[PDB]
Design an enzyme around this catalytic site. Structure first.
Site, PDB file in Angstrom:
ATOM      1  N   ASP A  95      -7.935  -0.854  -2.286  1.00  0.00           N
ATOM      2  CA  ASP A  95      -7.517  -1.655  -1.139  1.00  0.00           C
ATOM      3  C   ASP A  95      -7.628  -0.860   0.155  1.00  0.00           C
ATOM      4  O   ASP A  95      -7.957  -1.416   1.211  1.00  0.00           O
ATOM      5  CB  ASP A  95      -6.090  -2.156  -1.333  1.00  0.00           C
ATOM      6  CG  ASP A  95      -5.970  -3.156  -2.458  1.00  0.00           C
ATOM      7  OD1 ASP A  95      -6.973  -3.382  -3.165  1.00  0.00           O
ATOM      8  OD2 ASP A  95      -4.871  -3.720  -2.638  1.00  0.00           O
ATOM      9  N   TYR A 139       4.874   1.404  -4.461  1.00  0.00           N
ATOM     10  CA  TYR A 139       5.525   2.693  -4.239  1.00  0.00           C
ATOM     11  C   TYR A 139       6.988   2.646  -4.660  1.00  0.00           C
ATOM     12  O   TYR A 139       7.493   3.585  -5.290  1.00  0.00           O
ATOM     13  CB  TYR A 139       5.405   3.104  -2.771  1.00  0.00           C
ATOM     14  CG  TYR A 139       4.003   3.466  -2.352  1.00  0.00           C
ATOM     15  CD1 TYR A 139       3.186   4.214  -3.183  1.00  0.00           C
ATOM     16  CD2 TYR A 139       3.496   3.062  -1.129  1.00  0.00           C
ATOM     17  CE1 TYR A 139       1.902   4.547  -2.811  1.00  0.00           C
ATOM     18  CE2 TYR A 139       2.212   3.391  -0.745  1.00  0.00           C
ATOM     19  CZ  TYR A 139       1.419   4.132  -1.591  1.00  0.00           C
ATOM     20  OH  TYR A 139       0.140   4.464  -1.212  1.00  0.00           O
ATOM     21  N   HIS A 141       1.361  -2.736  -1.568  1.00  0.00           N
ATOM     22  CA  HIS A 141       1.374  -1.286  -1.742  1.00  0.00           C
ATOM     23  C   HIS A 141       2.787  -0.721  -1.646  1.00  0.00           C
ATOM     24  O   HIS A 141       3.165   0.164  -2.424  1.00  0.00           O
ATOM     25  CB  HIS A 141       0.483  -0.626  -0.697  1.00  0.00           C
ATOM     26  CG  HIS A 141      -0.971  -0.925  -0.862  1.00  0.00           C
ATOM     27  ND1 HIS A 141      -1.931  -0.408  -0.021  1.00  0.00           N
ATOM     28  CD2 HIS A 141      -1.631  -1.682  -1.768  1.00  0.00           C
ATOM     29  CE1 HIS A 141      -3.120  -0.837  -0.399  1.00  0.00           C
ATOM     30  NE2 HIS A 141      -2.966  -1.612  -1.457  1.00  0.00           N
TER      31      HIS A 141
END
Ligand SMILES: Nc1ncnc2c1ncn2[C@@H]1O[C@H](COP(=O)(O)OP(=O)(O)OP(=O)(O)O)[C@@H](O)[C@H]1O
Ligand SMILES: Nc1ncnc2c1ncn2[C@@H]1O[C@H](COP(=O)(O)OP(=O)(O)OP(=O)(O)O)[C@@H](O)[C@H]1O
Ligand SMILES: Nc1ncnc2c1ncn2[C@H]1C[C@H](O)[C@@H](COP(=O)(O)OP(=O)(O)OP(=O)(O)O)O1
Ligand SMILES: Nc1ncnc2c1ncn2[C@H]1C[C@H](O)[C@@H](COP(=O)(O)OP(=O)(O)OP(=O)(O)O)O1
Ligand SMILES: *N[C@@]1(O)C[C@H](n2ccc(N)nc2=O)O[C@@H]1COP(=O)(O)OP(=O)(O)O
Ligand SMILES: [Mg+2]
Ligand SMILES: [Mg+2]
Lengths: 375, 744, 254, 353
Positions: free
Chosen positions: D237, D122, D118
């Protein structure tokens, strides 16, 4: 005291790899060392699962093996399962509260996840080939040889974790705990960290490769090819893990991160050496334990010991250490067909292909260039 | 010595004697260069223990010799082969010298290893004459990979006890004698001798079913089976039964399952609702994996569906390793069918509409038959608001398809419009709606409602190949083709058909697929490469010669033995030749004029016809090329010493004539990109009746970002479409995994 | 029909219970499966089931039989399965249930069994398969022409046949597979349902029935050893396992 | 003392979730709680990479946005980046030296790896939508409106880690360090672990979903479509991680795993609720800060605050806590289109029949 997020805005291209300010913001647009970024990208592209390899023939080939060969295969699988169970949890506890750059932190977490995948794959192979895997998994923590071949890694990990907790909790200097004098030195902590990294290098670069050779010898005899594909996929990531540890050790020896680490490593040209020699001897003992009831075509005690010495020399040359064995050639050159996949052309309609990358596409599509195209 | 004692084959125990091993090694070392017996002995003696079986000693020395195959000493590839021969003879006759052919045939027929007819169609004198044709010394011309494939896959053997029964020369001579059994007695033995000389000298390559089953009493040698599944429970059951029956008899399966209605579609007007194609795909996969391919290798199948299927997004991800058991079928390959309309929607950035095939009457048939009708129906149905449909972005669908093709390497492409306009068959009468397992066979099929239904049509293709590295002139293809065609045609009258629909298709069309092998060796011998485009004219001339001679052989066979029963359904019956319906863009990359008189061939075909509907199809030759030590099909070799991995071994194969031609070879990962290879494939497709197993290869280290760009993948797909490439086979990727362990 | 109307007693509708009425509405009474409205009452259902069942009867005694059967069913003395109540009096003729299919040691037999399983699960019928006659893993095929890969791949094929018409892959398909205890693969077949194995060696969505006889029980009692054979390697043992116990004992000892 | 490899061959099917014998070997054929195995399998079946999503049009769309919408987008991206930068490392450090069953250990490792994925996503979005990614990454730390939440979230992790280190170093009891008395208690460490787990549940259940709503509101306007495509997988997720931590909290509260943690959960009935309402208030004030110099077509302070209250009510019911807001349906329905046998045999059967 350790903190998950540190409120000081540090510049992460000037921080050391270890023993600096704990990482606060995870950035991937800039790396102090790009090698860990490349390792993370390669590990992500190397994603795989044991379910993608058909292993129906592996049961049939295993049940037709003599007892001695089954013992060899199951012992290697049990040792690999236990050691990768250790390697899943150990970097995250020993190394994470010490890393001070985002790239190394992300690499350590990815490496731990890869080891969890590897342990799942070893368990998958054991579950496939054995009709009752409980009798096999229970003889892992109590196996004498497995314990003798595994403590020389968990011990270093435990020592590193112990004095890392002491350093994060008390700070440098001499303190009194329950009336006992405890000295917390950053020099000693750096020495233990280098020793633990050198132990992990030895493990992932020699012991797992000896086990890999043992598993691959069966496939060389047209037996248990699906387990061989799984082990080859595991070795593909093991190469990345050993490369990462080697780079971590070499960046701490040249002094490019800390001038003190260079001289600390120089004070380890016997200890680090002694550790590698001890690992080689432990592998020799493991090889003697494997071929006790009998040997196999293409692999016996002498051949495996020769390979142990060769791989120890090869992986000790790569971390600036002297060669403790005679400079020879590879006694089992066929192993090179299982670690180098450039000239390997498998029959895709008979066996699985182990040369696939996941999400290695740039994904950028410009419709303007495609519009000017005549079909 | 070490006072070691060995266990003999007869159960007795003897003393170690290194002189015998040295004698065997010297026997295997005759005429070889840069080979040292000392190294083999050094790597073998360390593995000898007390009570070691002599068979294990032979395996040890063979493996030690095979591990020494390298670019520095390629001749080991022969030493490891002859040794492996030495062991097979001893495992087959208990001695080196093979017995007389007649005695071996009688002994094998008694125990049921060979078909009885061999003893009825041939007398003892004819068997002695065929024994005179035999030369067992040719067994020394095999390579290590060739002998390993013979031992593990082709030689008649007991799959339970592991006992071998025959050598390679007996295999070749009995295949030749069994194919030409029904020929007139005056010219039968001359054809047998010529075919045996063609196969044993590696001029014609035979596929696995023929190489492993022609003398056997199981009489099915069609390498490729094409079954069409209908949107019916009876059709699904019949397809499953045919799959089980034909995988067990040495055949790969291509299932066209694009007619099954989408998930949620009403059944019987609303009484039941469809549960999706995934459970039926799982049923097909279990049918394929239940049995082996005649006890030789595991079964394999390829599923085909159109791109505009309502479930295409679910079907595209069926192969990758990122799902669960309820939404993944990873052990079958998949083929996506695309026409010009989808490519145009991708180019113009518009949307692609997906329908259930049951909800759009006539769309599925027009998908393959004619594209004007497909465009009209597609446009009509897109504006109909009463039809269940889903709109996706064309770029998104193509990106998903290419992502899955890159990650799994086994999401193949079929350009259905190219498969029908440039086809030997008439789309109106006999359209092509699918392909085979390896995407090289394109034959008409009809859905079956029962495993014994006579209205269905299952397509059968028997294969062969020309060794381009064994022909010194293209005119040599005149004779060989004849033999090839004749042999294959005779096989059609020799085979047995478990499914009557397959018999209908095989007897009606009589389709054969004759490809090529050693194409990379041919190019290297001619001093040309895949990339620079120097091979365009040479490929044009070579494949023009191949197609012309195959057509001439089939025409002579038809005028001698009658034309094909369904020849009227082919475009050849109307005077249409492959040099007429090829894609015109091919004129921009090849300037080579035709060298053979195609007008006389066209007139002859119009007057008499072709015995076979199809003659040419470029197979991958993954296993059959290893017998002749040839580069597989038209694929460049991955390395000078490549590794072929299969359940029957990990084998080191040297490219043919490595000593004098290593600089002239172009290895797969040394190719700038895919443009030259795709141009060569299109030039081949100009002449080939069927498709070509064309691979796309990408190395992500050749791009600045370290990642293959989606733009490059889409551009290569469009380029393949533009040059008339019917199908795309495997996508190979260079993962870059390298942990080299060489000497210090 | 007027005679049936005067035979009908609609007061019996007040003898049902709440769960009974809920089940009646859910699966018994005819209704529109889209709009969700019902069309018939319970008494009509019972009387029409009785009339349709006894339709092909002599007209001297047909009405009395219909009346007696309606009285028996409406009073809750004779109960008949849900498919009978949902199908009889309706245009359908599929009164499903459970089917027993025996599979021989042949590829044709396996294909026929799989086709029958597919054709019967689509009618929501339970399956009882007898696949115990399939020869064990490693048995020769055509005298060594092929190596048998065992019963597990064929069991997986049967399972996919059972789940072919199941929503989400595995939902309403039910089957039970039977094999003898003395099968050579019994150790690998008994563990087919636990999670300790991989997908390649597990068939978890089908139930299993082990077939035992006197000899196995007495060997367990005496603490002796049970011998397992492939059913194809023991001529007549499989037939004697069910038919003649003395013959089975003689053949087993031999 | 914590040991990576414990030599005692304990029975892992009866060990407690936490504070038992440290795990030595990983078992996949048997689990005390199968839910973590299912979570690991689902996480491996949802593996994705940020490079599989085209974000080329995102730069053009961001450059054409007004200043106040650009501010909202960049603040949301900064918040998500900080939250997942914390969540990458924090579970692997705080929870790993405390887990005593292999399945939970493997789940924690997989969860941390997914959070790293993640963070990489980003970074990918920030690098693809902004000329230089520095003016965002170096602003994340110094941003006043994010550092308070950073401290409030990392404090629980830091206190748990500190107490775990004292427990592993000294053990339970009263000790003297540098002349000061330190009391190491297993009850106190259990309370710290429960509070940290509740903080993680609040983080992945409430804090991330507000930012998901802000990111998806742009998608409903057909803007920043690649960002929405990435955030969809991130949300999947997230849902997986939230299920995992919810199961952890519920199994610790039920008392079926540790007869002592039930009391600690009962005594957190005020502290856990205070933590959750503090997190909800912090998200409401973040929403206030987001829309200050303007507002967006489909999102404003009011409806986003209603969404925060709704999501926190639903996620607080799941872990057995009293609802702190009035019952109200989802104010933004469009977001729903974007989210034990003893084996012994005697010889008495010989005399049976
Ligand atoms: N006495 C021996 N000492 C060492 N090697 C031997 C001996 N006898 C045979 N071998 C080796 O064993 C290998 C296999 O031999 P072979 O296949 O002929 O089986 P065998 O035991 O010799 O039985 P036989 O020759 O009587 O059929 C040969 O390469 C041969 O050199
Ligand atoms: N003339 C030959 N040329 C090549 N290979 C041979 C020849 N004769 C035998 N071989 C091979 O060499 C191996 C052994 O041959 P052979 O049986 O004659 O001697 P041996 O088994 O090694 O010793 P012994 O005579 O005691 O049995 C066999 O595999 C056999 O097929
Ligand atoms: N009960 C079922 N559940 C799920 N799918 C089914 C079921 N029955 C049939 N199917 C599948 C099989 C075919 O692929 C498809 C069409 O049904 P089919 O076999 O042709 O019977 P049918 O002829 O009575 O219905 P229809 O007239 O709609 O085709 O639906
Ligand atoms: N190719 C195969 N691979 C695996 N199993 C097979 C194969 N062919 C058949 N079987 C199984 C199916 C049956 O359970 C069993 C016997 O098959 P069968 O269809 O009756 O062949 P067959 O009559 O030609 O030889 P046999 O007389 O030995 O049975 O073996
Ligand atoms: N008709 C086919 O395309 C599929 C089938 N086939 C090939 C390989 C494997 N493992 N299983 C199969 O079912 O044969 C042909 C493909 O032709 P080739 O692959 O080139 O023939 P061969 O190499 O096996 O001899
Ligand atoms: Mg129908
Ligand atoms: Mg049979």
């Amino acid at each position: 005291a350790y903190t998950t997020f540190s409120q000081t805005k540090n510049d992460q291209l000037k921080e050391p790899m270890f023993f600096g300010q704990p990482v606060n913001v995870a950035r991937y647009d800039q790396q102090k060392y790009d090698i860990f970024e490349k390792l993370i990208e390669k590990q992500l592209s190397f994603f795989w699962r044991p379910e993608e390899v058909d292993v129906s023939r592996d049961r049939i080939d295993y049940q037709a093996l003599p007892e001695h060969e089954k013992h060899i295969f199951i012992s290697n699988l049990k040792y690999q399962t236990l050691l990768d169970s250790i390697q899943g949890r150990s970097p995250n506890v020993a190394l994470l509260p010490l890393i001070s750059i985002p790239e190394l932190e992300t690499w350590v977490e990815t490496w731990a996840f890869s080891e969890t995948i590897h342990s799942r794959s070893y368990t998958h192979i054991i579950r496939n080939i054995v009709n009752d895997p409980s009798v096999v998994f229970d003889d892992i923590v109590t196996n004498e040889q497995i314990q003798k071949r595994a403590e020389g890694i968990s011990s270093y990990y435990d020592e590193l974790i112990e004095m890392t907790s002491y350093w994060h909790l008390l700070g440098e200097g001499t303190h009194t705990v329950n009336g006992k004098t405890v000295t917390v030195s950053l020099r000693e902590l750096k020495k233990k960290l280098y020793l633990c990294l050198m132990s992990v290098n030895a493990l992932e670069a020699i012991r797992f490769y000896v086990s890999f050779a043992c598993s691959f010898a069966f496939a060389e005899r047209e037996l248990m090819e699906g387990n061989a594909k799984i082990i080859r996929l595991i070795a593909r990531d093991e190469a990345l893990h050993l490369t990462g540890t080697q780079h971590m050790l070499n960046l701490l020896r040249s002094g490019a991160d800390d001038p003190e680490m260079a001289e600390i490593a120089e004070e380890c040209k016997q200890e680090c050496y002694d550790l590698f020699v001890q690992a080689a001897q432990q592998e020799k003992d493991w090889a003697d334990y494997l071929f006790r009831d009998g040997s196999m075509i293409g692999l016996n005690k002498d051949i495996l010991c020769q390979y142990v010495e060769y791989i120890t020399n090869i992986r000790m040359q790569a971390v600036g250490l002297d060669l403790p064995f005679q400079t020879r050639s590879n006694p089992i050159p066929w192993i090179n067909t299982w670690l180098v996949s450039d000239n390997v052309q498998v029959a895709p309609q008979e066996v699985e292909v182990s040369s696939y990358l996941v999400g290695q596409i740039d994904s950028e599509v410009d419709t303007d260039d495609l519009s000017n195209f005549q079909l | 010595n070490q006072n070691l004692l060995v266990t003999k084959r007869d159960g007795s125990t003897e003393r170690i004697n290194l002189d015998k091993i040295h004698r065997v090694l010297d026997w295997a070392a005759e005429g070889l260069h840069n080979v040292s017996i000392s190294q083999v002995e050094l790597r073998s003696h360390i593995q000898f223990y007390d009570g070691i079986k002599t068979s294990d000693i032979h395996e040890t020395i063979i493996k030690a010799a095979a591990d020494l195959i390298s670019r520095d000493a390629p001749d080991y590839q022969y030493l490891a082969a002859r040794l492996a021969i030495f062991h097979l003879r001893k495992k087959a006759y208990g001695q080196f010298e093979p017995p007389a052919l007649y005695d071996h045939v009688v002994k094998m027929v008694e125990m049921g290893k060979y078909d009885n007819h061999l003893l009825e169609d041939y007398t003892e004198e004819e068997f002695k004459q065929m024994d005179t044709f035999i030369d067992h010394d040719r067994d020394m011309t095999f390579s290590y990979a060739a002998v390993k494939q013979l031992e593990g896959k082709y030689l008649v053997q007991n799959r339970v006890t592991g006992e071998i029964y025959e050598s390679a020369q007996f295999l070749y001579i009995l295949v030749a004698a069994c194919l030409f059994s029904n020929y007139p007695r005056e010219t039968r033995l001359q054809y047998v001798k010529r075919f045996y000389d063609a196969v044993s000298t590696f001029k014609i390559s035979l596929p696995t079913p023929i190489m492993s089953g022609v003398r056997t009493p199981t009489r099915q040698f069609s390498s490729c089976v094409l079954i069409e599944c209908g949107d019916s429970l009876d059709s699904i059951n019949a397809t499953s039964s045919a799959i089980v029956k034909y995988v067990s008899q040495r055949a790969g399966i291509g299932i066209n399952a694009g007619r099954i209605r989408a998930l949620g579609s009403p059944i019987r007007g609303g009484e039941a609702f469809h549960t999706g194609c995934i459970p039926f795909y799982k049923h097909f996969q279990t049918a394929v994996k239940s049995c082996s391919q005649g006890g030789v290798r595991g079964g394999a199948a390829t599923l085909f569906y159109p791109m505009w299927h309502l479930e295409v997004e679910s079907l595209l991800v069926l192969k990758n390793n990122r799902g669960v058991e309820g939404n993944r079928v990873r052990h079958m390959d998949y083929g996506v069918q695309i026409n010009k309309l989808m490519y145009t929607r991708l180019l113009k950035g518009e949307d692609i509409t997906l329908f259930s095939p049951s909800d759009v009457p006539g769309l599925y048939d027009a998908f393959f038959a004619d594209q004007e009708e497909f465009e009209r129906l597609y446009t009509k149905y897109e504006k109909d608001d009463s039809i269940r449909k889903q709109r996706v972005k064309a770029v998104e669908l193509f990106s998903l398809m290419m992502q899955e093709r890159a990650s799994t390497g086994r999401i193949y492409i079929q350009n259905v419009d190219h498969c029908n306009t440039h086809s030997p068959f008439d789309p109106a009468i006999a359209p092509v709606r699918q392909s085979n397992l390896c995407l090289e066979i394109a034959l008409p099929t009809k859905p079956l409602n029962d495993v014994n239904d006579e209205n269905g049509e299952i397509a059968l293709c028997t294969l062969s190949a020309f060794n381009l590295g064994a022909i010194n002139n293209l005119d040599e293809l005149e004779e060989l083709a004849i033999l090839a065609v004749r042999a294959l045609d005779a096989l059609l009258d020799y085979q047995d058909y478990p499914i009557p629909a397959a018999k209908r298709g095989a007897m009606g069309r009589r389709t054969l697929g004759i490809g090529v092998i050693n194409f990379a060796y041919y190019l290297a011998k001619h001093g040309k490469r895949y990339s620079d485009g120097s091979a365009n004219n040479l490929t044009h001339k070579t494949f023009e010669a191949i197609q012309y001679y195959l057509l001439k052989a089939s025409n002579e066979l038809a005028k001698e033995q009658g034309a094909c029963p369904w020849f009227n359904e082919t475009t050849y019956a109307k005077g249409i030749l492959p040099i007429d319906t090829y894609k015109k863009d091919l004129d921009t990359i090849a300037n080579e004029p035709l060298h053979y008189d195609w007008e006389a061939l066209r007139e002859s075909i119009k007057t008499h016809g072709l015995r076979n509907s199809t003659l040419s199809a470029l197979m991958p030759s993954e296993t059959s090329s290893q017998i002749s030590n040839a580069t597989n099909g038209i694929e460049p070799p991955r390395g000078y010493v490549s590794i072929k991995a299969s359940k029957d071994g990990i084998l080191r194969q040297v490219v043919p004539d490595y000593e004098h031609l290593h600089d002239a070879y172009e290895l797969l990962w040394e190719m700038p990109g895919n443009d030259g290879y795709l141009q060569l494939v299109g030039i081949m497709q100009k002449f080939i009746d069927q498709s070509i197993s064309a691979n796309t290869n990408y190395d992500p280290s050749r791009f600045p970002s370290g990642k293959v760009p989606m733009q490059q993948l889409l551009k290569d797909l469009l380029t393949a479409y533009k040059f008339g490439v019917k199908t795309l086979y495997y996508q190979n990727t260079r993962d870059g995994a390298e942990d080299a362990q060489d000497d210090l």
